[PDB]
Structures are given as C-alpha cells and as structure tokens.
C-alpha cells in the first residue's frame with residue numbers, strides 16, 4: 001500500500017491488538033475506491049495457522065447488512081413492500097398485537113420491544129410461531145427502537161417468502177453471486193473449513209452456535225477480500241449491474257428513523273459526515289447500542305446520503321467485526337478479529353484510520 005496508509009493502519013492496529021489481546025485480525029482499507037489489506041496473528045492458535053486474506057471470520061451482526069440489502073432487493077423486485085403488514089407474509093400470525101406492525105418495523109427494530117435474542121428453547125418452526133404469537137409489545141409500533149435479532153431476523157425470513165427460495169438460496173443467488181463474493185457463506189462448506197478461523201472466548205476456541213433465525217441475524221462468515229468488495233459495493237451502488245440489487249443497496253442506506261444523532265437503515269446505521277467521533281465511538285458501546293430509545297420517524301425516509309458515516313458492528317461469542325465507510329470520500333474500512341473485544345475500541349481505531357486518510 002502507499003506508505004501513508006501502511007503507517008496509519010499499523011500505528012493504530014498494532015497497539016489495539018496488544019491492548020485487546022486479539023489473537024488474529026484482518027483489516028481492509030478502501031482508499032479512493034481501491035482495497036489494501038493487512039493481516040496479523042492467528043486464525044487457529046493451536047494449529048499455528050496464520051490469518052491470511054483467505055481466512056473466514058464470523059461477521060456476527062454485520063450479517064444484518066446483507067439481510068438489509070437482500071430485503072432491499074426484494075422490495076426493488078416488487079416482491080414485498082416495507083409498508084406491508086407482517087401478517088401478509090405470515091397469515092398464521094393472528095394475534096392482535098400484530099395489527100399495525102409492518103415489515104419496516106421488523107427491519108428497523110421498531111415493532112415495539114421484540115427481544116434482542118430469540119429464546120434458546122425456540123427450535124422448530126412451530127416454536128417460532130408460538131413465540132411471536134405470545135410476544136407482548138411494551139410499546140406501540142414505530143415509537144421505540146430496541147436492537148433485536150428477533151426483529152430483523154424475522155424480517156429476513158419473511159422478505160424471501162414470495163421468491164419461494166430459502167433465505168440462504170436467495171442470499172447466494174441475489175447478493176453473493178452478483179457481487180462476486182465467492183468466499184462468503186451462511187454455512188461454511190467442507191472445502192473451505194481449512195480457512196475458517198476459530199473464535200476465542202475466555203481463551204477457548206469456539207464457533208457460532210446454531211440458533212433460530214441465525215442466518216438472517218448473525219450467521220454470515222466471510223474473508224477480508226470479500227468484505228472489502230462488500231464495502232466497495234455499498235460505497236458505489238450505482239456501479240452494480242443488477243438493477244434491483246443496485247436499488248436494494250440504496251434502500252438499505254435510506255434513513256428511516258432517528259435517535260440522537262444516528263439514523264437507522266436496513267441493517268446499516270448512519271450518521272451525518274463529518275461525525276463527532278465521541279458520538280460514534282461512545283455510541284457504539286453496547287450500553288447505548290443495545291438500549292431502548294425513542295425514535296423519530298423520517299417521513300418519508302431520506303434516500304442514501306453520500307455525506308454519511310455508514311457502519312455496523314458485529315459480534316459472535318468468539319469474533320468481533322466492524323465495517324464503516326463514507327460514500328462522499330470513496331473511503332472505508334473493514335476490521336475482522338477472532339475475539340469479541342469492546343465496540344468502542346473498534347470504532348475508535350476505525351475513526352483514527354479514516355480521519356487520517358480523509
């Protein structure tokens with residue numbers, strides 16, 4: 001890379017890895033639209049396997065950006081509308097509290113207090129129906145945001161129903177394949193296992209556990225090269241050849257709700273650029289990010305603003321990811337690590353890198 005990028009990235013990430021005891025990390029910087037890659041440490045400590053540009057990391061909640069874009073693509077196809085009642089796609093959801101809860105509410109965590117986690121006990125499809133039928137909202141729809149896998153996870157599952165495709169098949173054919181993300185997986189194939197890093201949680205090697213709506217909410221694994229391509233795609237949607245995917249990307253960066261200085265998209269979250277760094281850094285801490293907050297509707301939603309800091313943090317038990325980009329500046333970063341280390345440290349590092357390059 002140019003020495004400036006090298007210097008900026010190494011000066012920032014070296015101390016981060018040391019301070020957070022991260023076993024392995026991959027970073028991509030997208031600069032003037034071109035990617036530059038950096039790798040450190042171990043994908044598998046026991047087998048002494050280094051992180052490379054081919055290493056697969058669990059993205060955790062960064063998966064929600066793919067779910068958001070896939071939903072966007074289904075909207076662009078005319079298959080679903082965000083204004084549709086949830087019950088249009090799940091007629092068995094007959095309980096009265098669902099009246100007035102739309103696909104938009106599910107997608108944006110504003111249905112009225114759906115919980116962060118789908119309960120462990122929920123396995124089967126019937127367990128899932130029973131859970132949603134019995135769930136009681138704390139709030140009216142479209143009044144409070146509570147970040148929730150059970151919310152966007154259900155959005156993802158319903159969004160693909162008119163296609164008739166499984167969620168995984170729709171994601172592969174409609175998003176991964178057209179974008180040439182050929183090393184991005186909801187389920188890691190046996191051929192690619194040699195590249196799948198272990199995550200580390202309290203010193204133990206772990207991978208994501210199966211759970212209901214896992215694919216839709218936290219289940220994607222990818223390499224640093226494919227994630228750099230994902231950023232490039234989201235930086236410049238209008239360069240994508242497939243028309244509905246182009247639009248779906250745009251729709252995912254539209255601003256539907258505001259809380260504080262953040263705006264909620266489909267999967268992506270956005271702030272006006274230039275941002276206050278304390279506001280994105282402190283705001284990324286789960287103490288704020290996972291809290292119940294009143295939202296103001298953006299009526300109608302503001303189409304993707306290029307002068308934005310667009311980002312998403314993601315974690316699984318053993319991994320911590322972060323992606324951020326600024327469309328106006330052709331600038332972005334992906335940070336993939338095999339330890340779930342605190343969000344503010346990720347954002348602080350990303351800001352220091354992008355601020356220096358901007």
Ligand SMILES: NS(=O)(=O)c1cc(Cl)sc1C(=O)O
Nearest residue numbers: 208209210211218315316317
């Ligand atoms: N499957 S789960 O326990 O609900 C779960 C949920 C998120 Cl988000 S990560 C994770 C894992 O297993 O690492």
